[PDB]
Amino acid sequence: SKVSVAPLHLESAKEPPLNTYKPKEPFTATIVSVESLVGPKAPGETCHIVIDHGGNVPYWEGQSYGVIPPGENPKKPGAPQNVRLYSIASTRYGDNFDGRTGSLCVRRAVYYDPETGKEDPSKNGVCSNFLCNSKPGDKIQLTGPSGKIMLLPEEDPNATHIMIATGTGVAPFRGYLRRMFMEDVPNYRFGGLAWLFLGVANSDSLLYDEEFTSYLKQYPDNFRYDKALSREQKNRSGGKMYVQDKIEEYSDEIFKLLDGGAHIYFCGLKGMMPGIQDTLKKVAERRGESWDQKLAQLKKNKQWHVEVY
Numbered sequence: 001s002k003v004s005v006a007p008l009h010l011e012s013a014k015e016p017p018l019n020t021y022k023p024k025e026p027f028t029a030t031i032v033s034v035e036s037l038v039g040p041k042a043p044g045e046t047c048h049i050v051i052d053h054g055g056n057v058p059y060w061e062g063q064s065y066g067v068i069p070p071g072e073n074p075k076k077p078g079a080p081q082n083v084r085l086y087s088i089a090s091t092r093y094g095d096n097f098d099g100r101t102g103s104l105c106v107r108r109a110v111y112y113d114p115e116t117g118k119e120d121p122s123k124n125g126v127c128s129n130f131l132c133n134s135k136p137g138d139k140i141q142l143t144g145p146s147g148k149i150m151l152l153p154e155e156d157p158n159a160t161h162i163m164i165a166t167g168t169g170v171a172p173f174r175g176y177l178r179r180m181f182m183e184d185v186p187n188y189r190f191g192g193l194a195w196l197f198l199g200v201a202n203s204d205s206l207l208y209d210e211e212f213t214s215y216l217k218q219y220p221d222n223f224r225y226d227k228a229l230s231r232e233q234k235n236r237s238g239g240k241m242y243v244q245d246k247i248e249e250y251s252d253e254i255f256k257l258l259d260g261g262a263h264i265y266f267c268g269l270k271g272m273m274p275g276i277q278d279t280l281k282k283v284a285e286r287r288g289e290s291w292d293q294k295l296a297q298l299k300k301n302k303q304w305h306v307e308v309y
């Protein structure tokens with residue numbers, strides 16, 4: 001039941017592509033589709049953007065594309081807008097299984113006055129709205145790809161990968177998990193444990209939930225999946241349910257896996273991290289361990305992978 005992907009020559013490169021296109025001469029890609037990923041109770045829109053790069057801007061899982069939105073740089077007259085980076089949410093083959101498209105998972109940044117709720121177009125996020133407002137056939141200026149922090153370590157096809165996402169931080173993990181489970185990639189046959197933790201505001205804010213739930217039924221011995229819905233759930237202590245609280249529910253299993261060599265990944269808004277560090281410190285203390293010591297070892301061993309923004 002693994003899906004045929006082409007072209008398999010995408011497996012031949014020994015190093016990830018980097019900076020293939022640069023801001024002064026971007027690649028003009030074409031939008032294939034834009035769809036909302038969220039339901040009516042979600043506090044804001046997050047969109048799935050499919051982009052046809054024609055095979056001209058290949059990438060590895062875990063990398064980012066740059067997008068240059070239209071208009072003048074407000075801080076520099078006559079100059080283009082600055083690049084905004086977006087974690088690629090697709091595998092190298094992309095959602096059409098053909099090596100021609102890549103996908104982004106984009107939260108629409110909308111401004112509301114803190115007192116009156118009143119909006120103001122001039123204070124909306126430029127690139128996120130540009131992307132979420134795009135339609136089939138629209139052109140986008142693409143740069144990159146870039147980034148190496150979130151490349152998937154494939155040396156051990158039976159490794160353990162613990163994936164901690166909030167919101168759009170699910171993006172690299174969608175790509176990892178399709179490569180691990182969905183696509184027929186003969187040179188990478190994953191037989192380890194992939195464990196996805198996802199924190200979002202509510203049920204309607206879930207991203208790609210049907211895809212992840214399907215892996216539980218297809219690969220029950222290789223995939224685990226836990227969700228934290230913060231506005232709809234409460235933690236053991238009674239402060240909104242964050243993803244850290246879900247990690248703590250599996251404290252012993254997770255620490256054992258880390259001690260056994262598991263990779264652990266964090267992606268999403270940088271505000272997710274302080275709570276996670278606090279929980280891990282408390283879990284370590286309860287076990288009689290120093291989290292500082294443990295984290296230093298995880299970093300030295302190249303087990304700790306963070307890309308937050």
Ligand SMILES: Cc1cc2c(cc1C)N(C[C@H](O)[C@H](O)[C@H](O)COP(=O)(O)OP(=O)(O)OC[C@H]1O[C@@H](n3cnc4c(N)ncnc43)[C@H](O)[C@@H]1O)c1[nH]c(=O)[nH]c(=O)c1N2
Pocket residue numbers: 064084085086087088105106107108109110111122123124125126127128129168169171307308309
């Ligand atoms: C490695 C990496 C990977 C990613 C990302 C970053 C990095 C470093 N990001 C973030 C992304 O690059 C980008 O920063 C956001 O999409 C916001 O960009 P905009 O162009 O929409 O906002 P823009 O840069 O135009 O504005 C920034 C913020 O300022 C606000 N603002 C503007 N003017 C204001 C004013 N006068 N008063 C008050 N507020 C004002 C806007 O509302 C917005 O919230 C991301 N994002 C994402 O959604 N998905 C992803 O997968 C990723 N991945």
